[PDB]
Amino acid sequence: AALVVDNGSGMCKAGFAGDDAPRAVFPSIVGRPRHDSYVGDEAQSKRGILTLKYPIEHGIVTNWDDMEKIWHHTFYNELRVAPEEHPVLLTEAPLNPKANREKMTQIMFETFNTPAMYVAIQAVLSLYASGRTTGIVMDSGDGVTHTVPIYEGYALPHAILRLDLAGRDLTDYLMKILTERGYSFTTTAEREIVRDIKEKLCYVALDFEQEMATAASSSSLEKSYELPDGQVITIGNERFRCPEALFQPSFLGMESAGIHETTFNSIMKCDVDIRKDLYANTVLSGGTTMYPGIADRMQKEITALAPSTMKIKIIAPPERKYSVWIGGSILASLSTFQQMWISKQEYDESGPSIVHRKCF
Amino acid sequence: AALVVDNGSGMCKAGFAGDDAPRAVFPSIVGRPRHQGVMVKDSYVGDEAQSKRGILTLKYPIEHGIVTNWDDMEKIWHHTFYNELRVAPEEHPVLLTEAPLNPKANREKMTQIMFETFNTPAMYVAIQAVLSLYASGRTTGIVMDSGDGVTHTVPIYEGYALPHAILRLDLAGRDLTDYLMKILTERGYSFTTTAEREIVRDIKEKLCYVALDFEQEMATAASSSSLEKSYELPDGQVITIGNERFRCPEALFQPSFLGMESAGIHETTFNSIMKCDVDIRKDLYANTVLSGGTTMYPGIADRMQKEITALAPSTMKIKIIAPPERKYSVWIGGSILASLSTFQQMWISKQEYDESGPSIVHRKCF
Amino acid sequence: AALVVDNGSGMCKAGFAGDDAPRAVFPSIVGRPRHQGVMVKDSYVGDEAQSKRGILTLKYPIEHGIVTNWDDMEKIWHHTFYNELRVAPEEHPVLLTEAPLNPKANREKMTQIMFETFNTPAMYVAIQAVLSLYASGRTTGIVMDSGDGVTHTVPIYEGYALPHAILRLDLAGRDLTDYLMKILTERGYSFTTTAEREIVRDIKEKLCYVALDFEQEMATAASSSSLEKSYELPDGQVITIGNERFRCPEALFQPSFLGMESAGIHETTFNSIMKCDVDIRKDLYANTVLSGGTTMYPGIADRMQKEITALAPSTMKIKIIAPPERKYSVWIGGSILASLSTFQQMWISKQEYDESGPSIVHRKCF
Amino acid sequence: KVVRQSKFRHVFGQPVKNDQCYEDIRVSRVTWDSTFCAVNPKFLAVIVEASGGGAFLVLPLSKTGRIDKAYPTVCGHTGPVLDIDWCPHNDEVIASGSEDCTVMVWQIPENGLTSPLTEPVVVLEGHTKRVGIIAWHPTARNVLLSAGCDNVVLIWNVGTAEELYRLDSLHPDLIYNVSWNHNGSLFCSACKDKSVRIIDPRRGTLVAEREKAHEGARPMRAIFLADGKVFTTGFSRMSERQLALWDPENLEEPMALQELDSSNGALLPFYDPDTSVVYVCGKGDSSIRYFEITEEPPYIHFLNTFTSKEPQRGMGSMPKRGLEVSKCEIARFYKLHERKCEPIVMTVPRKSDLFQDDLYPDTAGPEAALEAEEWVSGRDADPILISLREAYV
Numbered sequence A: 001a002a003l004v005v006d007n008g009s010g011m012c013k014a015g016f017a018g019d020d021a022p023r024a025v026f027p028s029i030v031g032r033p034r035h036d037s038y039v040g041d042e043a044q045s046k047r048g049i050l051t052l053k054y055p056i057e058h059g060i061v062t063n064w065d066d067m068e069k070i071w072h073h074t075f076y077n078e079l080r081v082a083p084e085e086h087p088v089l090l091t092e093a094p095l096n097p098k099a100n101r102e103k104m105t106q107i108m109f110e111t112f113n114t115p116a117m118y119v120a121i122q123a124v125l126s127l128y129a130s131g132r133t134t135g136i137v138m139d140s141g142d143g144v145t146h147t148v149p150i151y152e153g154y155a156l157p158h159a160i161l162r163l164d165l166a167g168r169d170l171t172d173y174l175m176k177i178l179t180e181r182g183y184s185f186t187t188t189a190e191r192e193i194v195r196d197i198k199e200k201l202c203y204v205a206l207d208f209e210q211e212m213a214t215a216a217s218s219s220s221l222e223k224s225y226e227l228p229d230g231q232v233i234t235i236g237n238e239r240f241r242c243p244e245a246l247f248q249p250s251f252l253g254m255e256s257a258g259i260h261e262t263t264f265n266s267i268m269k270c271d272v273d274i275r276k277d278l279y280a281n282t283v284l285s286g287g288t289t290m291y292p293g294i295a296d297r298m299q300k301e302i303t304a305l306a307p308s309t310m311k312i313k314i315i316a317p318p319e320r321k322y323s324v325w326i327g328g329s330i331l332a333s334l335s336t337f338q339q340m341w342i343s344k345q346e347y348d349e350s351g352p353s354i355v356h357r358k359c360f
Numbered sequence B, C: 001a002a003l004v005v006d007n008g009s010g011m012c013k014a015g016f017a018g019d020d021a022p023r024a025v026f027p028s029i030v031g032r033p034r035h036q037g038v039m040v041k042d043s044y045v046g047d048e049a050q051s052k053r054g055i056l057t058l059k060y061p062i063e064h065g066i067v068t069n070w071d072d073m074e075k076i077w078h079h080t081f082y083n084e085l086r087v088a089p090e091e092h093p094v095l096l097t098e099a100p101l102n103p104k105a106n107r108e109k110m111t112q113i114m115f116e117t118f119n120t121p122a123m124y125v126a127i128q129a130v131l132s133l134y135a136s137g138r139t140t141g142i143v144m145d146s147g148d149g150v151t152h153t154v155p156i157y158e159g160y161a162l163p164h165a166i167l168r169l170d171l172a173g174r175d176l177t178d179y180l181m182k183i184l185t186e187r188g189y190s191f192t193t194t195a196e197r198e199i200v201r202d203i204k205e206k207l208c209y210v211a212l213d214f215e216q217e218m219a220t221a222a223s224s225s226s227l228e229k230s231y232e233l234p235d236g237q238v239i240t241i242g243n244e245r246f247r248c249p250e251a252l253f254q255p256s257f258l259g260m261e262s263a264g265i266h267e268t269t270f271n272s273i274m275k276c277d278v279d280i281r282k283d284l285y286a287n288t289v290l291s292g293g294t295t296m297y298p299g300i301a302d303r304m305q306k307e308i309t310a311l312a313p314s315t316m317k318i319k320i321i322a323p324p325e326r327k328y329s330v331w332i333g334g335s336i337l338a339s340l341s342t343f344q345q346m347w348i349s350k351q352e353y354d355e356s357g358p359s360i361v362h363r364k365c366f
Numbered sequence D: 001k002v003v004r005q006s007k008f009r010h011v012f013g014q015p016v017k018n019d020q021c022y023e024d025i026r027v028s029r030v031t032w033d034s035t036f037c038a039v040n041p042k043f044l045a046v047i048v049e050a051s052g053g054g055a056f057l058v059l060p061l062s063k064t065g066r067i068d069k070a071y072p073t074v075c076g077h078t079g080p081v082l083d084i085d086w087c088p089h090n091d092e093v094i095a096s097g098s099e100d101c102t103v104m105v106w107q108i109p110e111n112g113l114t115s116p117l118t119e120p121v122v123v124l125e126g127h128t129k130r131v132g133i134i135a136w137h138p139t140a141r142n143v144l145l146s147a148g149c150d151n152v153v154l155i156w157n158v159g160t161a162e163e164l165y166r167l168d169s170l171h172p173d174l175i176y177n178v179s180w181n182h183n184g185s186l187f188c189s190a191c192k193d194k195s196v197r198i199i200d201p202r203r204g205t206l207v208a209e210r211e212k213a214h215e216g217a218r219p220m221r222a223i224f225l226a227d228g229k230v231f232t233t234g235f236s237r238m239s240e241r242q243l244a245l246w247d248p249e250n251l252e253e254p255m256a257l258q259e260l261d262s263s264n265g266a267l268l269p270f271y272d273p274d275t276s277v278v279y280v281c282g283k284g285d286s287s288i289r290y291f292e293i294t295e296e297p298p299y300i301h302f303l304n305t306f307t308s309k310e311p312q313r314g315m316g317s318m319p320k321r322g323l324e325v326s327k328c329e330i331a332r333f334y335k336l337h338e339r340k341c342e343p344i345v346m347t348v349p350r351k352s353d354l355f356q357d358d359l360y361p362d363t364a365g366p367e368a369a370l371e372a373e374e375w376v377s378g379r380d381a382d383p384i385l386i387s388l389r390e391a392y393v
């Protein structure tokens, strides 16, 4: 029985190989009292007196001691399994620094004593869940957004683009614009409330300027949300202004281009002979791509950029929030994957030189 | 002659363009009687409410920089034009000030009242952090204003503002005044009524200061009486305060004293700079400008320089610019801007607003 | 007094004929503000855009040796004559430099701008590779000039150029600067904005070097800290880089690092020699001349000599000539050529161009 | 009293959405400082690069989005095209001057071009050098003006291919631009000798002249206003771009002289006679400044500036008949990038959704008042005015 653990910036999904959905999904949050530590949903329930901190910021480890707490919470508190009795499949961000991968390998083999372990690129696993071997995966998670083109199973690192704009930036932007309506959220506890608001009432408009016009001359686009303490707040144009930062990073003062142009630019960096198939296999992944209407807006924007003769097809499966995890479960069940396993007895005699190879 | 009106959470400064100091500085309070009249005006605004506060219930129309009740807000403006300045608002254009990242709904009400209720011929709204930079004669610097309701840190580089780097702190003079009461009951003095709010606030403005080393100042105050001062209450009673002089302003640097999770003003200023581009952080370190009445404590500049230096890299030069008239920096900057010959193209006519609406005031402003 | 202007992809060097160094060396960028002005010039070029780059979006008008925007290109030239050289273009002959195998359309635009926009009295266009040979005092040799946009290998024998043997490599300083940014994120440092591109370029010019043996240094850097250097960011932050010092310049010899299938600069130089006649290959092996800023990395001469020797026959003598002033070899060669008594016959008058057109500049040139 | 009375102090620019732009257009790379764009309520004409000779792209306004690289173009000239201009009295007739020293007038089908157009209706040959200035007469039908680098101005009859008048001994240097007056009896010209001239073509005499209107050596422009005044843009001795208003009755000193900035590139003014608003647009600049011409001093009131991030290579202005009145339109500008044509929307912010009588006075119509034969005889007439209220939806 193999374990699949996909460590994201905000959510850490864990489960067992061969399953269809993650058995354990909890926020990657370490909370400490401000009036000795709480991790995950136990921090989420007591966040009234806790100072919530994310151990991952922009896909970068800021505190490895908190990271071990997240992993300790997965094995013993959520999965309820012994890490030394199950092979564990890890997921890594594209262009993952070899220093970051080594620490992941070192912790798993020395602190948790796992028998077998393997690290896979999140973009590759996202394509397995869709049953494809060719296409560009735009995985937008909590910390960072990546565009990884893939052709016939071959990865092209030179065409991988990174956008420092993801779910956390949208959540912080929603708080900034919510004060324009009169609701003030400042503490880290209120960040989760705003994030909960973003996941329920936000959506991507097909056109932004027109959506401003109807929201400024009609009350059909307003929705009501209930706070934990009972006050009901209403939001109008903030529903689609927050996700618009994905396509217009200038709202956040950022100079880089939107996630539609980043996807197009990553294709433009590929060879000419493969661009046609990448246009027709644009795969969305991550929780930041779960906004209603994000697929239609993506298709309209990329079509305006791509030549008229190319068929833009945005693939947005309904379970794309767990595509990375689902792809990991399928890999951990394939018969051809057993030769990818890295043994503990192999690591202690060889070191991280064997994990830098046998991986990508 | 243009009018410059700076309506803060606690104080409202008004005057004429071209002057060096506000002509009218009165508290932004509205008082209503709480007893019954037995001997043969239902509200008082400004100094007249402060003098009769013994029988009134003082209410601040602005709290945390948001206007709680607009009906008393119009009374503040009405008192300003007719009773303090004693001018006709329909004759002089009015230059108004707004907090950074002001909601467009709040700005819309502010201009609509001016054009419809007071019938001002022209009107304009400017960001308070911008005028505070005009008073110091600079084009680059991070302005940390601290008034009565809220604290803003606005970095500006070469006349370009960075809205994404603007940070807010829900901690200002009113919160410190409330905190001083909580620690004053420790010494045996009880202040509870809104009338006593102005008494405690007056104590804070006269006896409080910022200690360079907070832990050392506790050690000195716990073993000596050199730090004790005496204050006379309006009824003639004399009270003495010790370590409360510098414990109250310490909430600005340690918001945990109020149970707040946010960081202090020194870290908020530092975090605002780090949100800017790397190539402009060098100038922002050497052009830190203080503004507002809450930055008038003795020794606040020295403590600010020490704290930011410990956070900033050693090779950067930290300069805390604290002009002695920083309590009126926003108004002084407003008078300077309203007198420049290049500002007459920014006025918004009453006629133009009638035919166009608030669409033209959202533009032409920032 | 003739003017020698060398317009490169990243830098523009200008001066007067007869001098030994360019009087004006400024980056060839155009910067435009990316924020809004909140207090009382829409474009910045040259060093002025470098000092204000924290609030501008820097664009290179020349990309891969191709002018992407002629409206920005004329700004660079206007800055050169009026702001850097501070001279009137209509009073001095201007000697321009062009890339090898330059498109005839590009040369047409360059000639047209000088004669109608700046109204230069005389003008001539010279091949950058030929000028680089003038500065070294040679008439025979293969010039491998690597600038910011494109790498060229031009063999010249006894004053005769071999156009069929000229090879082009789309890999230069700008491609290395982008590659250094990608690998710096592996160490935790994030540079994304165009303003941060210049900072990374500054790091590349100071701490990068070419390893004599790439693999043996990777083992040294992974088992020692002797190759680690520290760099100070403009905001005072200090970054440390290790193996990235020689991994970025290694991309010149291993273009597969950037996903490019073309050969390295060592093989491109060797392939260009093999494309010439057999009789002249001996002289080109002993007169390999380096030029451009991308060949200024310490230890690039020995690595080039080591690689070419492994490709060339054992009896051939490989001699890489890398003068210490090779960063300005194109300009210095231009100054030498513009001062020769036999060069005045090559000038093209404005009156001649007005009555004859661009047919006369395609001739009289190469 | 505090604020100058005006209706356009709050006019703001707004670029049109991407799907309504025109992409993949090989915009011309000719150093000549022309508008590079001519637009009428029916078609859009853009000067493009051709492999050989010269051509300009004419496409219907509805043909938005990306444009085929093989889209048919008007490729009849043997040299690059310099200037294009639609016929004010015929929406399917456009004249073009090019490097081949010839002026060609074309007839565009109602649906546009299905095949490349090579044969013109009439070929105007009267010049020895390149023709870069073409200006249709505002009221005279089939009367066209051509000015070339040979410093000669010709009056053409496109109906009969007849040269009416030849003006050769009036410009000693290069001609920058030529603009007719309101009734088309005179025309102003800016010359390379820094002199502004007002010339009567019928009589062939110099009505007025101002030497050293701008001290700078950089190119300058000059247009005629509705009231008969001349608005000129130029450079000072310190390379400062300036605007100036001139009175033909006394040219000793200008009524106004305002400096803008220290950038390069000529200033191309776009005058709107109904609103008395001049739009000053610089070649290669990324901003558009518009000023209101009035009788109150300083006679030039800066209104506001539209700012963008892309330099402009060309710009064309839609006439009054083509704007959509229902949304308070006063001007629509087709800003030209290097590979894209982006329409620009300028509106007056108004709360009322009804037709605005004050914003839209009667405009010159597509009906010519006089004819070529009557104009030569000595007749002068103002353009026939029409009402835009019928265009309100």
Ligand SMILES: Nc1ncnc2c1ncn2[C@@H]1O[C@H](COP(=O)(O)OP(=O)(O)O)[C@@H](O)[C@H]1O
Pocket (backbone or CB within 6 Å): A007, A008, A009, A010, A011, A012, A140, A141, A142, A143, A167, A168, A171, A195, A198, A199, A200, A202, A285, A286, A287, A288, A289, A290, A291, A321
């Ligand atoms: N239904 C939803 N709509 C919009 N955003 C969502 C939704 N569900 C989750 N998100 C956002 O997606 C972000 C990242 O989710 P996820 O893809 O799990 O990130 P990671 O890959 O780092 O685990 C979260 O910050 C969350 O706010």
Ligand SMILES: Nc1ncnc2c1ncn2[C@@H]1O[C@H](COP(=O)(O)OP(=O)(O)O)[C@@H](O)[C@H]1O
Pocket (backbone or CB within 6 Å): B007, B008, B009, B010, B011, B012, B146, B147, B148, B149, B173, B174, B177, B201, B204, B205, B206, B291, B292, B293, B294, B295, B296, B297, B327
């Ligand atoms: N000399 C002083 N020392 C300490 N605090 C002061 C002093 N003067 C004023 N304050 C405090 O500053 C607060 C706000 O003053 P001000 O800067 O006018 O705010 P606003 O901008 O809201 O009008 C007041 O509540 C007052 O308590």
Ligand SMILES: Nc1ncnc2c1ncn2[C@@H]1O[C@H](COP(=O)(O)OP(=O)(O)O)[C@@H](O)[C@H]1O
Pocket (backbone or CB within 6 Å): C007, C008, C009, C010, C011, C012, C146, C147, C148, C149, C173, C174, C201, C204, C205, C206, C208, C291, C292, C293, C294, C295, C296, C297, C327
């Ligand atoms: N000492 C140096 N070390 C490494 N790179 C350098 C050095 N000096 C200049 N360069 C690089 O050379 C590049 C181009 O310089 P240059 O030869 O002037 O190009 P061009 O010919 O296009 O003007 C610059 O981008 C710069 O990064």
Ligand SMILES: [Mg+2]
Pocket (backbone or CB within 6 Å): A008, A009, A122, A139, A140, A141, A142, A286, A324
């Ligand atoms: Mg993820």
Ligand SMILES: [Mg+2]
Pocket (backbone or CB within 6 Å): B008, B009, B128, B145, B146, B147, B148, B292, B330
């Ligand atoms: Mg204030």
Ligand SMILES: [Mg+2]
Pocket (backbone or CB within 6 Å): C008, C009, C128, C145, C146, C147, C148, C292, C330
């Ligand atoms: Mg060069």
